[PDB]
Ligand binder design. Structure first.
Ligand SMILES: [Cl-]
Ligand SMILES: [Cl-]
Lengths: 99, 96, 80, 107, 98, 80, 96, 108
């Protein structure tokens, strides 16, 4: 046979990898393009200090990761291992981000 | 001759009789309205204060008070609040 | 264009990983892109207000910091 | 000297004087514009009206003419925005909106 | 011999108390508890009757809200009873413990 | 030296009832009393500190308010 | 040349060399230390101010900064900060 | 004629002068006592060391001379009290504490 790891093993290696590192996990430009998009909804022909974009990317990722953390606990709370919309939803409801 | 504690209770009562002339208000509920005023006072005075500081300004203008309101208040409440704001200021600079 | 889809399935995975998630439902990627959108939306607004009040056409690292601090979400390392 | 309140030049109930004084005394800035305490007393009025409107309506349905806390609560939690605004705000004698999650109901 | 089935008086009691606004903790026990806890931080302290009730308002508000968050955590795990672990989850997510 | 136990099973139930809970583990009431303790402790600490800084031997409703506010647990109708 | 942005970075260096004489600090982190100082400045000044106002004082004394620190900082951290603060005050007063 | 810098009179490395100015120009109050800035520069210095201590370590542990943000993150998040203090603070290029939830780990 050709060698193969078992569903959840590579995931765990990938957890160890990304909990060890600090580097931003979203692709810089795609994120930038997203930022300038969501900026057009408030004023046109805006500009952004290179540093203001990063300050957002660091602010976004940091945020999501901590949500996933609170999410992953609401999955585990329902005797699961798989995060699903209703888990995020519970996080945010309890966090008081939605109603 | 006791303290001399100022409330907002008499401006609540006026406005109340502008919007529901037949209805009243319990002291408990006036309490709540009073707190409410102070709370949104501080939040806007505050956010104005920063606005000023961040741009190196010594003066809080209407302009600060506006941006503050824009930041602090939700979509619709903010639109209307800006307007009664901008309305009231003009009516003032005209009056005399 | 539609740049929200530039937040690749792998990217949202990498983020769930750093958050300590083993297994991910398919439905998550669009919920996530969902929430990210609302985050960047609420934050950029308050930033641009700070940009606008300052009568600039360029959003400064501080604008975003002032914004993040406002929203509950203080950030170290971009000033202030 | 002619008697006229600033409030009554802006056409407000909410005291433009008191506000301007509260702004200077509160240590918000060195200098206060003449337009701020107007613009602020304007905005304070408007929110006092929105709340007292909605609440006045809540006091009818309860068959009551005097507002109690509970009306304010009912008023605020029922309005999406006011609730957004008073998220982290406890209202004494407010109580909670009636609400029972579906699954906890019997067939 | 009128008896109702485990959970029908609950559903009533919910509807009764969700509708009212009176404080649900007996007030003396409460008052004492405060002083007990004040001792810890300074001896021979005295309390404005209103300060106490302000704390009772805050507390009864705190708990009721927890219970609304607890109760969802319960339902989230396909249950209908709230258990310490439910609260524990709530507070952890709220940011009240690590 | 144990008033905590004054916070009676049937009372904690009344709170849970207003909070929309239908069914209650026994293990709960203690955990609850527990949480209440931390919450009162937390607030009164900050309260009394307000009291002490004002060289008063009487804690005032405003002490309790300035505290609830500090804790982000802001309260209306006691002098806000 | 260019306008002059102040910082805390020189006072962080000095304290770093007092504490770990064989250790450097990356720009990015020196930023993060700056932010930190600034954050905990505004927080102690803020609560200090609130304390003054609440009690009708126009003067923020060491007594306010102290009580500010007791409210903001957790138990152990507070004790020490109270101690390192009192110490500094005494040694300044006695110098003249 | 000879002007000793207040920071020296307190034996503080943090500038008690610049703290006094920042306060008066902060709009915190009308009047600042003269002990206040001392007391504050003191408390500031102190928490600056308290972090630079534990971080300074985190750097050695990784066999690194210069402290990077992540050392700070490790320092702050692992010490219980500092973590409570920076509860709502996000640390650039800080990453998270290594933590995998027990039930997820494989079955040996
Ligand atoms: Cl003006
Ligand atoms: Cl002093």
């Amino acid at each position: 046979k050709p060698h193969r790891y078992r569903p959840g093993t590579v995931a765990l290696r990938e957890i160890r990898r990304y909990q060890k590192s600090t580097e931003l996990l979203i692709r810089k430009l795609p994120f930038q393009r997203l930022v300038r998009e969501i900026a057009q909804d408030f004023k046109t022909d805006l500009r952004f200090q290179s540093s203001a974009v990063m300050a957002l990317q660091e602010a976004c990722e940091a945020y999501l990761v901590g949500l996933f953390e609170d999410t992953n606990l609401c999955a585990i709370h329902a005797k699961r291992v798989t995060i699903m919309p209703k888990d995020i939803q519970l996080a945010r409801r309890i966090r008081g981000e939605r109603a | 001759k006791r303290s001399r504690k100022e409330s907002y209770s008499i401006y609540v009562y006026k406005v109340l009789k502008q919007v529901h002339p037949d209805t009243g208000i319990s002291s408990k509920a006036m309490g709540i309205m009073n707190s409410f005023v102070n709370d949104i006072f501080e939040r806007i005075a505050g956010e104005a204060s920063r606005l000023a500081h961040y741009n190196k300004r010594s003066t809080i203008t209407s302009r600060e008070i506006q941006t503050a309101v824009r930041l602090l208040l939700p979509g619709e409440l903010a639109k209307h609040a800006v307007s009664e704001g901008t309305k009231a200021v003009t009516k003032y600079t005209s009056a005399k | 264009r539609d740049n929200i889809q530039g937040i690749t399935k792998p990217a949202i995975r990498r983020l769930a990983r750093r958050g300590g998630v083993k297994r991910i439902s398919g439905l998550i990627y669009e919920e996530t892109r969902g929430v990210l959108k609302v985050f960047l939306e609420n934050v950029i607004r308050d930033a641009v207000t700070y940009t606008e009040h300052a009568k600039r056409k360029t959003v400064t690292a501080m604008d975003v910091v002032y914004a993040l601090k406002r929203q509950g979400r203080t950030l170290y390392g971009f000033g202030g | 000297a002619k008697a006229k309140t600033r409030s009554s030049r802006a056409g407000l109930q909410f005291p433009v004087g008191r506000v301007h004084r509260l702004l200077r005394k509160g240590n918000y800035s060195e200098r206060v514009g003449a337009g701020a305490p107007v613009y602020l007393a304007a905005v304070l009025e408007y929110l006092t009206a929105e709340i007292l409107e909605l609440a006045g309506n809540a006091a009818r349905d309860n068959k009551k003419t005097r507002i109690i806390p509970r009306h304010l609560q009912l008023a605020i939690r029922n309005d999406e925005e006011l609730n957004k605004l008073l998220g982290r705000v406890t209202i004494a004698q407010g109580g909670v909106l009636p609400n029972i999650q579906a699954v906890l109901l019997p067939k």
